[PDB]
């Protein structure tokens, strides 16, 4: 009963992104990943994932709160669901801002909670 549902993981912890990618693929999602936080907004514009998993603390001084802020202010990208993963200390503050994520999963992330959250936002694919 499979139907295509695409996820992009923006994460420079590539061990974690591999773990999450495998877990999501196990439920039938089509999954890509990138370490390129700087390019991520434009990659989302190009590739049009159905959901993005976005880390807070990215390489090269990139920051998932800033990236999500940009996505949510972009009239053509602000409807893409975003799950932020990271140190949970900042999540409540982010929720109070106008431009914020759709869901949050604390690091250390359990791949099951992340898969659960993705499925609850866009449905499973099969
Ligand atoms: Cl992080």
Residue numbers in the entry: -1 to 124
From the study:
To test whether the environment of Tyr102 is important for domain function, we mutated His92, which forms a hydrogen bond to the buried Tyr102 hydroxyl group in the FrzS RD structure, to a phenylalanine. The His92Phe mutation blocked social motility to the same extent as the Tyr102Ala mutation with no effect on protein stability. The His92Phe mutant crystallized in a distinct monoclinic space group (P21), with one crystal contact within 4 Å of the α4-β5-α5 output face, as quantified by the Crystal Contacts Analysis Server. In total, the intermolecular contact area decreased from an average of 4806 Å2/RD-monomer in the hexagonal crystals to 1594 Å2/monomer in the monoclinic His92Phe RD crystals. The His92Phe replacement was expected to cause the Tyr102 side chain to switch to the outward facing rotamer due to the increased volume of Phe and the loss of the hydrogen bond between Tyr102 and the His92 side chains. The overall Cα RMSD for the His92Phe variant and hexagonal wild-type RD structures was 0.35 Å. In summary, the His92Phe RD structure is nearly identical to the hexagonal wild-type RD structure in both the dynamic β3-α3 loop and the output face of the RD. Rather, the His92Phe mutation may compromise an alternative conformation of the α4-β5-α5 face or interrupt a signalling pathway required to switch the conformation of Tyr102 and to retain FrzS at the leading pole during S-motility.
The Myxococcus xanthus FrzS protein transits from pole-to-pole within the cell, accumulating at the pole that defines the direction of movement in social (S) motility. Here we show using atomic-resolution crystallography and NMR that the FrzS receiver domain (RD) displays the conserved switch Tyr102 in an unusual conformation, lacks the conserved Asp phosphorylation site, and fails to bind Mg2+ or the phosphoryl analogue, Mg2+·BeF3. The crystal structures of the mutants suggested that the observed conformation of Tyr102 in the wild-type FrzS RD is not sufficient for function. These results support the model that FrzS contains a novel ‘pseudo-receiver domain’ whose function requires recognition of the RD output face but not Asp phosphorylation.
